[PDB]
Amino acid sequence: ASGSALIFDEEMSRYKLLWTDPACEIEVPERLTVSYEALRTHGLAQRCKAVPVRQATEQEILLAHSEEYLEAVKQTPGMNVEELMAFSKKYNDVYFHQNIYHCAKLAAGATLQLVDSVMKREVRNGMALVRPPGHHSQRSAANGFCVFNNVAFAALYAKKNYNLNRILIVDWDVHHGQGIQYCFEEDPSVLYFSWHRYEHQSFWPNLPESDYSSVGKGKGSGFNINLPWNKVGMTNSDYLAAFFHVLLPVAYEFDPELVIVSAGFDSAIGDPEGEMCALPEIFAHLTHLLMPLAAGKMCVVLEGGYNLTSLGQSVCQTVHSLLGDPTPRISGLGTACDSALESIQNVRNVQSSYWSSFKHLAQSVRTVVVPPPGVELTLPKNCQHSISESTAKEVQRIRDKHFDQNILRSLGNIISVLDRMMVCNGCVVVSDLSVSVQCALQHALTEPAERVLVVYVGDGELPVKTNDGKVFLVQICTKETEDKCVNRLTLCGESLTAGFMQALLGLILPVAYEFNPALVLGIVEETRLMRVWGHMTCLIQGLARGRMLTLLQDKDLLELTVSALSGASISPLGPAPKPEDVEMMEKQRQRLQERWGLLRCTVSESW
Ligand SMILES: NCCCNCCCCCC(O)(O)C(F)(F)F
Ligand SMILES: [K+]
Ligand SMILES: [K+]
Ligand SMILES: [Zn+2]
């Protein structure tokens, strides 16, 4: 798997609302032209394999629609304006054009082309700049601004033409995709997640099925997840707490073979129909947190977004992470608001009967590797290798100051890898630890690095303190090591490669994102349990703009380390840990949700 696909055609911009209708005036053809021109300006569309648009055959349109309804819209190109707005009134909040039936077939055919490109390994992922939208249309009705359900096409299409059993659909538009839910209501093959502006049913489409109540029907119960926003103005911490505490936990245990997203960017600050406060760069992290799933095979499909002057900002942030570009640091993170915590609390409980990890107790080169000198590995063409008189004087300065061996090559490289990163990231095999870890961050704290995230697996204490607020330590052991300092975290069978994940999504990732570090420092000791380190290394790349320095003490582990630093696809894990292991997590979630509010998944108890 190599590039990334971008499907688009100017022809889908040649149909518009031809009368006065305040319901659909926000839906204009200029949404599609500004999104491509934004990708063109920032030097993004030129970096993606442009797959041409095809039409969707009526053999494919009947996968999710009835013949009675397809023949009804097939007669629209011959209707005049008087006849068109009469046909548009038989449906709710939608308009039709002389060219809309032609563009809607291009709408489905665009996503299907994206599905084929991603599933044939032609590309690693992709995005479809497409109009009209999709997730409102049902089996025999047009609704919202949509005619045919674009990503519901893709799901049954991928279910049919590729024999895939587990497809994850994410709908981060803030309108409920009721067409998706209806299509796969009784279907456990397709897991549909959807957050949306609800306001206690006050907001369109005003459906009871949009509430967290609806989990599914029949054998498909458990694979429909609705997270209703009950107040407007949700921020980045609200959106990320959602991912960390409901979507990502069940996604990795769902272990999807293909992830499809309903990209709606009215969830961003400035959109008149969404009225939310999330910055455009939050979408760079939404996609990134979904890349370890399905080995990266992710097909983004456009839905909503109406602030023309800011819609292009988030479509580029989506493509930026799609190409693997460094994600921007998110500052100002904290606790989700009380209503967001109320919604995340409710659906976590209603879904707890299926995803049991929700139960509660009663109340251009971007990496550099310096491996043990003399080794030669096969590196994916975006890596390099090794000091200098500028650097050696610093190593000599530190040599007699605080501390002979060949570890002075460990240090000379460790200094120059950090000088080079402040290239994106790196990784170094190290001799003795304490001198390597000490020289690493002590040289990093003066790089300058405002704050330094530190992740270390192994036992015993590492050689640095967490007194001030410029450092935070993550550690996974075999012993208890009950800590008291809040700027730290110590954690801990065959359940290790399965319980560590939900401890990374539910605990490690939330505190780090609030920490907003300038540099991540990964350390492991020789001691292994390797089936998971690649999944970890991938998701922290969302912090510190990707700058992470890994220190292995080396085994075959190095080959998998650099795999995620370089941006390659990440191996799936396959689909529940120990009870004493999650008692370990909430014993430190209650301890840490004081300082770091992003760990909270319930509304605070008032004193
Ligand atoms: N202010 C009045 C508008 C009321 N009609 C609701 C519009 C539905 C929005 C559709 C959408 O944004 O969800 C899509 F992604 F499909 F494009
Ligand atoms: K939605
Ligand atoms: K479902
Ligand atoms: Zn929308």
UniProtKB/Swiss-Prot annotation:
UniProt-recorded Gene Ontology molecular function terms: acetylputrescine deacetylase activity; acetylspermidine deacetylase activity; deacetylase activity; zinc ion binding
Described function: Polyamine deacetylase (PDAC), which acts preferentially on N(8)-acetylspermidine, and also on acetylcadaverine and acetylputrescine. Exhibits attenuated catalytic activity toward N(1),N(8)-diacetylspermidine and very low activity, if any, toward N(1)-acetylspermidine. Has a very weak lysine deacetylase, if any.
Organism in which the protein naturally occurs: Danio rerio (Zebrafish)
CDD domains: HDAC10 (cd11683)
Position of sequence motif Substrate specificity: 22-25
Name of the protein in its database record: Polyamine deacetylase HDAC10
Compartments where located: Cytoplasm; Nucleus
Site residues by UniProt (Substrate specificity): 273
Effect in UniProt of substituting residue 93 to A: No effect on steady-state kinetic parameters
Pfam families per the UniProt record, alphabetical: Hist_deacetyl
UniProt superkingdom: Eukaryota
Lineage summary: Eukaryota, Metazoa, Chordata, Craniata, Vertebrata
Residues noted as binding substrate in the record, renumbered to the chain: 21, 93, 306
GO cellular component: cytoplasm; nucleus
E.C. designation(s): 3.5.1.48, 3.5.1.62
Keywords annotated in UniProt: Cytoplasm, Hydrolase, Metal-binding, Nucleus, Zinc
Consequence when changing residue 92 to A: No effect on steady-state kinetic parameters
Family indicated by similarity: Belongs to the histone deacetylase family. HD type 2 subfamily.
